[PDB]
Specification:
There is one protein chain. By secondary structure, this protein is α/β, with parallel strands linked by helices. The protein has a single domain (1-333), classed as TIM Barrel. 38% of the residues lie in helices and 11% in strands. The chain is built from eleven helices and ten strands. The strands form two sheets. Strands 6-3-2-1-10-9-8-7 form an eight-stranded parallel beta sheet, with helices on one face. Strands 4-5 form a two-stranded antiparallel sheet. The protein starts with a strand and ends in a 5-residue tail after the last helix. The structure holds ligand OAN. The ligand CC(=O)N[C@H]1/C(=N/OC(=O)Nc2ccccc2)O[C@H](CO)[C@@H](O)[C@@H]1O binds at residues 62, 114, 126, 160-161, 165, 204, 243, 246, 273. The PDB classes it as hydrolase. Keywords: TIM-barrel, hydrolase. The assembly is monomeric. The entry is titled "Vibrio cholerae family 3 glycoside hydrolase (NagZ) in complex with PUGNAc". The protein is Beta-hexosaminidase.
């Protein structure tokens, strides 16, 4: 596995896709809604991806629940992460949500969901009800349960967006938001806790500048990714970059330079989404490096959707998640 996560255009692989996936710089494919038509098509696509790579390759997706669920039709709907804490039995429900989400992905030959969100609060429009709560303890109580669910079925976990994206409430009018708070201790406490617990296999940093701490976005900052994340907090897992196709070239250079800089800053792996031309430029021009420790993120269990549906745990979780959505969704009222 190499450092690069890239994506494909549609429901099946093109000839170019099959060629690219063999490249040693590729480590993973991130799937989007545009790669999902139906359950059988998804299984076929994932088989094809793994066959084309001719070595282990990660298949990942943003499948959080609520506003962020790429595969919906023919899957169980998972609620916004916010909903668990709104119910009296929120800890049990959060575990069910994590388990169900992860299990259905595993059953369709996906390695991992980029989850959970450990951001604090609902006031950042991009985050909102993706957060488990608005205070440290509510977020920890419910995210920990969600994590336990994911781990129960052998899915690797990813905390995001380190050191916390919950309070980005102003618009910088630039490509990189700023969070101007003099202290983000509460936000970081959540990440510290989950790292110490040993329950995060990976971390995605925030593309956010925290000027009272450091001048660079966390996702491109040695301060955040090395000094804090590694040395102070003792994180031993995989660090993913921000989506590099998002970064402008006027300051950061072209996609090859941006990839290099992310890796030097402390990322293990880099993401280039929705920009095939950039991904190919990086494959064509980035010196080859291996990320063997990424193999830790490969899913640990194998089962089919038929098998999953025969489990009481599935029958209950699916019913309970639909009911939880119905309890708090404005759409269902
Ligand atoms: C803060 C946030 O929602 N980041 C998401 C995220 N955000 O990506 C962008 O914001 N990309 C972008 C934004 C503006 C212009 C071009 C790309 O991408 C990752 C992969 O899909 C997700 O795992 C992250 O959760």
């Amino acid at each position: 596995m190499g450092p690069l996560w890239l994506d494909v255009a549609g429901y099946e692989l093109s000839a170019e896709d099959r060629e690219i996936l063999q490249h040693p710089t590729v480590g993973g494919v991130i799937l989007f809604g545009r790669n999902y038509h139906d359950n059988q098509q998804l299984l076929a696509l994932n088989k094809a991806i793994r066959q084309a790579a001719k070595r282990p390759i990660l298949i990942g997706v943003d499948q959080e629940g609520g506003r962020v669920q790429r595969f919906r039709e023919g899957f169980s709907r998972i609620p916004p992460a916010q909903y668990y804490a709104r119910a009296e039995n929120g800890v049990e429900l959060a575990e069910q949500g994590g388990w169900l989400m992860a299990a259905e992905l595993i059953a369709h030959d996906v390695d991992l969901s980029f989850a959970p969100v450990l951001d604090m609060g609902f006031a950042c429009k991009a985050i909102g009800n993706r957060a488990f709560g608005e205070d440290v303890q509510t977020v920890l109580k419910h995210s920990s349960a969600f994590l336990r669910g994911m781990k129960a079925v052998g899915m690797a976990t990813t905390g995001k967006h380190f050191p916390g994206h919950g309070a980005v409430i102003a618009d910088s009018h630039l490509e990189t938001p700023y969070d101007e708070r003099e202290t983000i201790a509460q936000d970081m406490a959540i990440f510290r806790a989950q790292i110490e617990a040993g329950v995060l296999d990976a971390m995605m940093p925030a593309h956010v500048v925290y000027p009272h701490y450091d001048a660079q976005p966390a996702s491109g900052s040695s301060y955040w990714l090395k000094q804090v994340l590694r040395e102070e907090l003792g994180f031993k897992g995989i660090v993913f970059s921000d989506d590099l196709s998002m970064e402008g070239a006027a300051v950061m250079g072209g996609p090859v330079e941006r990839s290099h800089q992310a890796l030097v800053a402390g990322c293990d792996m880099i993401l280039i989404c929705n920009k095939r031309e950039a991904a190919v430029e990086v494959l064509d021009n980035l010196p080859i490096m291996e990320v063997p420790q990424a193999e830790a993120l490969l899913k640990k269990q194998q089962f089919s959707y038929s098998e999953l549906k025969r489990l009481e745990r599935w029958q209950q979780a699916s019913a309970n998640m639909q009911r939880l959505i119905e309890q708090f969704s404005e759409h269902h009222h």
